[PDB]
Design a protein around this ligand. Sequence first.
Ligand SMILES: [Au+]
Lengths: 652, 5
Amino acid sequence: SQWYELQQLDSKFLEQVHQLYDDSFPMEIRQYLAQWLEKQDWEHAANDVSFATIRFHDLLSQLDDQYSRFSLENNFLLQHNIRKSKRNLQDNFQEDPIQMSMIIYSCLKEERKILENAQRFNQAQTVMLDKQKELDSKVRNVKDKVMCIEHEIKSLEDLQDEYDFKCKTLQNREAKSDQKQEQLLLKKMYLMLDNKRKEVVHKIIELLNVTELTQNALINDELVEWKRRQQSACIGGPPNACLDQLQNWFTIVAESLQQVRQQLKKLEELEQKYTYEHDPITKNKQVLWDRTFSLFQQLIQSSFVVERQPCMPTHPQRPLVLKTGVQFTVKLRLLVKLQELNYNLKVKVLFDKDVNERNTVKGFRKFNILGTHTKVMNMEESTNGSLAAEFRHLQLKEQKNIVTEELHSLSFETQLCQPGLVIDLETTSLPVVVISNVSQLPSGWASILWYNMLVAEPRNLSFFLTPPCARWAQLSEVLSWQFSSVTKRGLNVDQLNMLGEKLLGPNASPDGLIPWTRFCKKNFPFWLWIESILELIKKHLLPLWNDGCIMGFISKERERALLKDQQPGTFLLRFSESSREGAITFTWVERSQEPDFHAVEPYTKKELSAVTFPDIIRNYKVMAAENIPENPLKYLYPNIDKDHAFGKYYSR
Amino acid sequence: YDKPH
Ligand SMILES: [Au+]
């Protein structure tokens, strides 16, 4: 069916499919009666009441058949849903089937566009793809090699045992002198052990060499990259890759090391049983045992990371910003994962531990954690499980009696206790910002935005003393992101450009450079400004904004640019640059016996809370040159009819 | 801003 065909597209189209189904015509129906629907001549019914009415009841009857199909399967849910869908459909169109037909028609019709527009497979006729592939190889290698060694150690151990047994046998029985020259039958046996031992030692070394080398990539590339993405991701960037891939690489090399350790033990047990001047096991004994633990210790300390940065469940929109007295959560996790580690790692949270500013910086506020300070890392069934501790129940508290842009950090300590084995693990979250009142979130978020967009390290906490600058090519992206995360759409080239200039003047360059002072520093700043627009958009213009029926960012300069020489009615929707509250306004052109340009005093939520913007756009009215009221709003930008465009949004 | 609400 056309329905099926759609569910077979890239998540970018099926996402638009989503935005075609609301409670008016429940998608539940569009799917459970897709073959019936796709069949009917909706275009016709959209024009003839009787056909429409006939089909409306047919549609209802088709629902009844579907209800009974579910009754058989006892699918209590769908029975209930179908039931509701029918009841809805019913009292929404049983008096106007012509419109329900028009709905189904355009809905199916708009689906095709998407399948037609989804054939961009023409524009489809290795970066990380290859990288990821190599690591799997080295890692796999390390693995295999360990097993190979473990296999010769066993062959090594056996020979020695026979060998021993054979010697003992001779020197334990009842011209014999010349026959005692059989000592060579031993001399031979020895040259074997020596050679086999030297061999094992070689491989164990080679193995270490490799391992370390492969461990460098894993910890110095993969780990670092993932950490950086986690940052952007927390800042509104693309979804961060889960750990599973790392968690696997780490966990594998880890097992290998752990085994080499066992191998080293096995080797000494063979030394006890037998040694000699220049025995390799004895010579390498130490170096090896040490190289191994060295690698293994580094490995497992690198694996202890913050999987979910500090976040307040109440303001999930702003991760790294913590409000005093409000509860928050963080989640730690060890990328290694060995059963021999379950419940053996008690993790403790420390706020601002090892911080200079606690003394260095003057006034530097100081807070104290209040909830549960310690948690033990458990396993939790993912598709691969994972070894991690999570902290719900954390509260920050002010211990009292630059401005609020001071950074603090959360510390996580734990330790591995085993036989004559003890490793201390510690790691910290990205810098945090503590605030007292909600009003600071925007500002606070600004800091986090700056910090994470520029720094790569997890600690400095003094970043805002010499705030770097930002390459517009970079600030611009981060900004789009701020939108493409509160709404279904980000900022575009045109919108970005206006913003570019309002920061870099006219000579806007991808390599421009914006000081942090020209971002969150006679009326309020940029970020605070951009922020309050997102506020407005969110609580008063989402659909209009999402559907792209808002230009939002044009300079009054480029404003007329497009508005000059254009359909008299034509108007434009933009956000005010003036208001320190966030407001939109419109501008349009008129002919008055060149073009005349007009714009309304920006509308703020103060208004929009009383009358919908679309409604305002609808009933607006001004004095025409003929001293007779009428509203100049005729065409949206590319010549769309006022009603044509904002039609669905109209209150009534 | 030349025109009123
Ligand atoms: Au985050």
